[model samples]
Target: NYRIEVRVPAKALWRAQTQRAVENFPISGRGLERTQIRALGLLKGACAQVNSDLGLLAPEKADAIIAAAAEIADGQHDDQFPIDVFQTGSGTSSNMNTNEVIASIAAKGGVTLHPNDDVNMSQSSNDTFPTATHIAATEAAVAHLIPALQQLHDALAAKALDWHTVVKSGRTHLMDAVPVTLGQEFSGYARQIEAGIERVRACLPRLGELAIGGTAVGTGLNAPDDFGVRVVAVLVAQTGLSELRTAANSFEAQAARDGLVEASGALRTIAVSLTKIANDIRWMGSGPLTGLAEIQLPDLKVNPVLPEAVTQVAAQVIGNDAAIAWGGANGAFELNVYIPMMARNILESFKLLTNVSRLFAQRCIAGLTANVEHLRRLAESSPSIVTPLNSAIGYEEAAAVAKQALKERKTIRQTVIDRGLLSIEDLDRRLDVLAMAKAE
Candidate 1:
């Protein structure tokens, strides 16, 4: 038998159900993220306002609940939400945990409140948990992730402009192909991040739709028809999210986690883009000796760390996205039991990408410098620079010149001039490497 401790206030905050959850799952030892807790507080506050307006809750009780919720939203009671995120598939334990804590706080404000009867009136864990998850994800994306991505894009764009004249050999299939300006390479990365931002923004509207008031199994059973709409209105005001509104099909919203999956898909894409850009930077800044040595990156130790960390974060986000997809598809009949896991992973992905983007921008991208001489040396030596000579000397002759240049370890221009296929002046004009990096 397990002995559960209760404070002097005894039954003030938690009750039998919350106690049962505490005793059952000691799984992750990790509690809910603060953002999710804040989201729950927002939901509870809005629900109280709606219930009070409908005359279901007394004014004093509603005021106390609202005040307590504000404290929760302000992160004042984070420690009070001790339930693990892995508890109860439906997340009822966490939901009830919030209700119990708020009820205790409301009582201290001189109003009698019951956790279930008044605080959770008309709200069910089924709908509220998913609703809170969406709120947390959307807010994290808008408030943190998007801004971080924009900063990264801005940093890359600045490098693109600053390095526009620095030309270097472009690689295809890990083999030299043609010349490209450092600016062009950085601009490509910048565009990839910019597109990722748009993709994430496109998914935000869907996330804004809520599943509240779809009590139990989306039948809206005991909940008033106006409850979800009114509650969402209050939530919009409290959260300053003007886009938030009740879901069109609450049943679908609760049953199918398409919204989260779609959002995760966006996050997955951003992760992929970040991985590609990071890898590109790592390769370009490979070594001062044997590698490409095209661009000189800052703090060799610190610069590699950002891209490497971004790569790891991207992989984790992709893995989390797969789990979210599984949760979305595995929902049984009326309710998705995987809601808690989905919520945890989606929020984690958002936060990971947010922090990684900011770090990558500040530590690696903003401080990069071009290895102008190294870039020129590589461009001049590359046999593929003979590509333009194909148009002048014919493909067969150009191939011969390239092979001789590689064998002799001489520059393509020198080999061509030695062969007398083209004069130094003509070769310089025709093989303008810097011009090769630009578009015709």
Candidate 2:
């Protein structure tokens, strides 16, 4: 037998990596590490195909070898291998870990195994690490971000539809303005989510494309020609995803962080939308006692104390119980206690308040008032008062005219005519047509 060095297979590397992680790190955690492992497995399976297709191994043998590897890649061996991604050594251990796991899996099939020779074939830590990272991130985004955003979007959309007829005070610059339907507010939030989802979806295409073929610094020094494309093709086939493509410029793909930046941006957009919606809801539910508590939330019980004034205000506008109980009277400086039940109470109150407010606004206020009639009366005997023609314009444009009229201290009808929009009679007629159409 010729003396030669046999590098550990991918499967063996995986075992070592996992064993080391457990021994050295010893901290149990969730998700990120497991996800990284799975992603690397996927990359390993993909690379195996790439190597095989390049005539590094005969086609029939390659197919069988890769098929066996694919089982591990497809997550068949999740139980035997246990490793967390967060460890020392900058993921070298993880890469090697995957290498070992794949090799061991190959060995089970009675194939002769040299981890580095057969399993890793022609790959390095550098190329494989980044490729796995890309694959993992993309997979997570698809599995987590897309569905999360969809749930949020659909829920917001439902709220919008539910609150469609409900009218509540509109705030501009944090000051009370006219009135807008709660449905309208929810609708706007839904639209924001919709737009964000679209943006995130666009990023998937970029994320799905892999840089696997470049191998070790993207020069493909040890990798065979057609390896990159072939691996990507196998990955797409295995995963049932057509989005995976080889990067045009492997060097940039290998070292550059642009893909991560763009993908992260997509997630950031969703986060921003969530933050905005949460802030809006929080503001609307603020101060059951002191703040503009015009819209009563579902079940609000607020009690807050001001040091200067011996007054207890509502801490949460909706909920049966307060989040905290204060013993101090005004400036008495009494200690505050946070009760666990308070959070549940607050959430319940918020939901109830939202529901009740929605009902009252839609059932009471909107039922008694019509937007077109309100606009017509507000327009006052300005030229369009008779025809109500301006009322037919979209709400945004109508609002613009209303704003201009207020600023100029003139009627909306006069504002419309002055702006060469329509005569007073035309405005009235349009308003009548709109109201009639709406009622119909």
Candidate 3:
């Protein structure tokens, strides 16, 4: 094995490097690839750009450093470093990797540079690593997670609208309660997703405020007086993202992992909602032989493959939440009850809709065909039996009259006229307006 030793006279620098190289780097089994790591890298590059732009160094030097760093961070040049980040503590190896990569690029352009003396001047991993981590996580959530959630919400919305007219037995506490429209059920799910998206959004400001200026703990002792503010300005210019602010309390930002914990909490909240929806769908879709079996989900096909796939999605959602719960992150305990339930909700929706459709199709095409006369009898005897003459009653009063007319075996229009609720002329005008509305 080739031993690469870095010598540092500053005790803090040595401590930071040693912590990162040995303790932190070994956690590579987190299963994060360069693609994921590059998110963090881009964040670092953004910070570096800000630092360099603030006249932290010569303009050319800053450009070369930032360009090289960006390349590595973008994962376009991953071969420059062979080591995974699993083994580092303070992430010093990764930090050094960043410096060396920049130095190589600078050297190729005929400028002499050293990784420590030039590229990493006045920087410490303590500040840089956490800052970059927060920035990367925030950006990824903004660009990727938020959009994915929006699409999910839209999909549920479409399903809700499509199935709204199907009236079925509404269940509460797993017992039949009352009748509700299928559309109403789905609209509730869509609303839950909307709320989850909002929760994630509200966490952005906390995630965006970084610890870049908190060099070597909370004190900015060795850093230039104006370095923190100026560098952050440059970063904002380069990234075109608003809300990238310096930490108000550098001490909290640097030493405590609260920011990461807060971000993870927000993510977990969203995951919880997703899990509930998936689980509900799965449960609803279960058992064509033994379950409620009301609707049929066309896309899912109600097959072993589709149910299995949905179950897996739900399991992964809960699994992610569980991992975060066990990972010593913040707000862990609060998610325990809801995460699994969320998965069940999703699975339930899938199954419920499938059965609901199956029942509706059967009632309209198969059942109704066999009982045409009985159906017609029931319709004719419906409460509003004023049928032939006063079919144009307002839906509310008409419904009441229809139910009563059916019970009493009276005509709905005649009943309304007898009750002085409406006249034949009024009925005619209402019917015309109703017909016009339908045509439109």
Candidate 4:
């Protein structure tokens, strides 16, 4: 039998546990997302501060760990975290990786501290991993996703105001039915984004409930009774999110991922809303010569790719939501074994939504212009325009006029005049497109 000896560098940052994890899970070569790494650093920093406050750790060692963690959070040591994202489900390997790195950095600063005894003194991978997930996802939604959606909403609202008087034919079942203003259509899209933002905000309070001090299996074992409250307070002050708080029930927090499920569900709804709005814009701006041709969207050489990319991003978020739901539902006993997957899915959904919302707003919605003359022509020529005259001409007579107009390829007004169905002056007054569009 051949034997292999693993030689660690003299100044190696990570230890045996991290090495074993690296060997066992040679699966995905990809590491944790940057936001997740930063969040883990934040949690480690808070834990060290709390441990020092309780006199459990030496102040100098705690200060060194805090400074190292701050560097990690600031993205200075990103490459140092090399474990694959598909490692132990509880993320124990990742936790140890972070602990060892901080401990080594502290040693460099002349403080001798053990990774487990000091860096991870009062925490467990089980609680800290999920807690970090909540922190990262919450910050991403509030900082990036919500702001991007608001930008899209504001852009659509501005376009609505600009196109308030541009009336076009309304379609139902892909057939013309009535008249509606371009402004009204754009206003509907704006409301969809507005509602999506509120849905995301509604889920933040649950995410704010952190499971920081629950420790292994959610019993707060080996942890002080007041650790959860004090640590969460520090996190709130550091992150500027005053709403942060400890979990109501540590057991449930560790055993169930329903909080993340609810957040992902909200993100899925926003994806659905964005898909509808993006498709509507794509359809309305279909062709300058052939398709509906009612509006002119900015022609980016990348236009063909833009909407498709948004659609794919939305589709992926929906799939990620489903994966998150599965992870949340399959929890067994006092702890969930799917924490890593849940964290990955939640962060992916938030990032995807944030990126696509900004891309669609900047590339498509902001550059759109109304095809005022074309919209007016279609609204006036549509056979459905005869509906407004139905009360005066009767349904059968109106239907006859519409059929003849379609057969002869003439405007409904022109057909009615040829058939002597209505006087030109009276028809002109009755068939006003703006009046029809605004009719209650």
Which lDDT values do the candidates have, in the order given? 0.86, 0.53, 0.52, 0.84
TM-score rank order: 4, 1, 3, 2
Off by over 4 Å in 1: 1-13, 300-303, 390-397, 418-423
Per-residue CA lDDT of model 2 for 49-156, tens digit only, reads 776656676565455456656675666666544544344322445566666666666666666555567667777655665566666666555555556556656766
Task: Give the alpha carbon lDDT tens digit for every residue of 1-440 in model 3.
Answer: 22334432221222234434544445443322453346445654554565565556676776777776677666765554443444333444656666665676767787666676667666665566555555555655565566656765676676666655444445678763334455566677788777877876887787777776667666876666665676567667766657677888777665455544455565555555655655555555556568545544443235434444434554554554454344323322211112212222222322333233233223211211112232233323334223334344456766666666657776444556656674568665543322321211
Best by lDDT: 1
Clashes of 3: 74
TM-score of 4: 0.94
At residue 178, candidate 4 shows an lDDT of: 87
TM-scores of the models, in the order given: 0.93, 0.60, 0.65, 0.94
- Deviation from native of the Cα of residue 84 in model 2, angstroms: 6.0
Q: Number of clashes in every candidate structure?
A: 0, 52, 74, 0
Candidate number achieving the greatest TM-score relative to the actual structure: 4
Task: Tell me the tens digit of each residue's lDDT in model 4 across 1-440.
Answer: 22223544554566677767777888878878889989889999999999999999888888998999998889877877778888877778888889988877877788888888888899876888888888888888888889999998998899889888888999889888788999988899999999999998898878778888899988999999999999998888998876577998999888988899999999999889878887887788776566776667777712545677788998999999999999999998888888888888899999988887888888888888778988887788888788778878998998998888888877788888888775678889888998888833
lDDT of model 4 at residue 277? 82
User: Positional deviation of 5 in candidate 4, in angstroms?
Assistant: 10
Over the full model, what C-alpha lDDT does candidate 3 score relative to the true structure? 0.52
Model 4 residue pairs with clashes? none
